[PDB]
Design a binder for these strands. Structure first.
Lengths: 21, 313, 291
DNA sequence: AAAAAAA
DNA sequence: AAAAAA
């Protein structure tokens, strides 16, 4: 699967939602 | 009652699909729009071959298409769309000949042909908008194998060249990439990847998407975002009494387009490539405008597709 | 007792727009300046064709422009500007012939022709200055599609080649980029994105921007900066009693963890003060403070 | 989140 | 400020 979160509505992009921390 | 664009689309789909065209189903409208876009771009069998500057390998496919028999009446399109016996007449009368250009038609001075070309252009725009919305809708529950990194996701949706020509500001893909890479003129339009597109059942009626509309979660999300957008956007929805399937819209995101976070160096200051970064990302918020007022909602930090997958488990 | 620079512009605007030209509205003055600039650059309908080295498409465009009907008296240019019957005479007598070069005018020795060419050049400079101010004003609330990174933002304003040829030190864009990416010399002028251009309503009368003159926040911000400049510059403006969208200038910036502690120098009525930067561009600040 | 260009 | 001059 893909865990990307593109930047939208002023939010910053995330290369991996799991690695976030 | 309706603008020229929506009236033209309604007339075309009615003429081509008889009573089989359901006006309240998004899937049926998307299929009809796709078929009409193919018809008006001469992508169906039996239409003019695109040979102007085509390479031999492309001329092979174009000649194969031209030689192939055109669709027959009663053919099944998509799931629940059936071609009428009078679709050939509509194709012959309402589709401009291959290579037609507005300048040549204007030079001719025929008002009827000018109106026909205007209707063709408006129909192409409407069909491409419906195509983009359907691409978002499909991406909500089906990852695109092509998109593996943020750079790939930057150019969603990956639609054909005709789509980009019709709606350069809503269509991404190879041609949006090419336009961005190349020289940028005054006419250059950037890819608004999260522009608000009403559902096809609303778009053909002319009803702008707003607060209070009785819509499903998936179709609202396809309207305001796509699969890889942040999950917090789901806050723009609220299930109705008894749950069921259809809920209501409680708000719409702000800054859907035109978000720039640059600060150029001036008066002895230093440039900033991104004000936000300049630092926990999960603390970010989105301004959802509701009926009462704008509220800042903390980002979920998770994709919309994965949120939908988890809530469906 | 205004300078010839402003007198020429005022006379041209009068001759071309009659009483419809309001000298107290920035938008009207910007529209008039744009029309005069496109008239003096031979860009209106029915004017000569730029076919010295035009390519096929450009040749066709110029020939169509020549063939097209020229503007006529009463035409609406913008929102509050109406052409007068004298505009044809002004275009015939004051606009130099296409391709005219000052070398040949000086060689001929005609004093009247030299004066006409000098007035044409001065008018072009004034019109381009007003164009740059209006570009800043527009960018305060709507950024150009070409500006996505700092490299792209370095060349604001993205104006035409004639604009750059008239004001190389103020105009940016493709031709400024080309000049930077080419040879440099004494004649080379560096783009100053924050050079102080007074508002057109002040510029056309020679009034220099100074502390204590009534202005609007957007007016001052466009006069001293543009949209992507740091928001701290908004401290150069202060609303009046009841605001009403009209305030007063309180300072003019100089030089026209630690990164966000950088300060700008503001010259106030007393002396130079250091004001900490805001960290957000004026465009973003205006968007967030709109409500 | 109007119209005119137009692999 | 004068000069130059896709």
């Amino acid at each position: 699967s893909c865990f990307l979160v593109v930047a939208s509505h002023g939010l910053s992009a995330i290369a991996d939602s799991r690695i976030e921390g | 009652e309706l603008p020229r664009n929506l009236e033209v689309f309604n007339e075309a789909c009615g003429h081509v699909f008889g009573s089989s065209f359901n006006r309240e189903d998004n899937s049926v409208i998307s299929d009809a729009a796709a078929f009409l876009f193919k018809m008006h771009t001469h992508s169906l069998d039996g239409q003019e071959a695109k040979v102007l500057r085509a390479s031999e390998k492309k001329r092979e496919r174009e000649n194969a298409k031209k030689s192939r028999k055109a669709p027959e009446a009663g053919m099944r399109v998509g799931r629940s769309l059936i071609l009428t016996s009078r679709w050939t007449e509509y194709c012959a009368t309402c589709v401009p000949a291959l290579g037609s250009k507005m300048k040549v038609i204007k030079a001719s001075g025929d008002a009827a042909m000018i109106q026909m070309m205007k209707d063709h252009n408006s129909l192409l725009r409407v069909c491409v908008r419906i195509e983009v919305w359907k691409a978002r809708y499909v991406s909500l529950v089906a990852l695109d194998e092509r998109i593996q990194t943020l750079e790939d996701a930057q150019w969603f949706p990956y639609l054909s060249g005709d789509s980009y020509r019709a709606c350069p500001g809503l269509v991404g893909g190879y041609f949006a990439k090419k336009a961005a890479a190349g020289e940028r003129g005054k006419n250059y339009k950037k890819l608004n990847q999260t522009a608000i597109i009403p559902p096809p059942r609303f778009l053909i009626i002319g009803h702008r998407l707003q607060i209070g509309d009785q819509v499903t979660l998936r179709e609202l999300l396809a309207s305001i975002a796509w699969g890889l957008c942040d999950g917090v956007l789901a806050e723009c929805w609220s299930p109705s009494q008894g749950d069921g399937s259809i809920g209501v819209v409680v708000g719409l995101p702000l800054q859907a387009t035109g978000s720039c976070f640059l600060v150029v160096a001036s008066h002895g200051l230093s440039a900033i490539a991104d004000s936000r970064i300049e630092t926990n990302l999960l603390e970010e918020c989105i301004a959802i405008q509701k009926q009462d007022g704008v509220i800042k909602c903390k980002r979920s930090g998770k994709s919309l597709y994965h949120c939908l997958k988890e809530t469906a488990g």
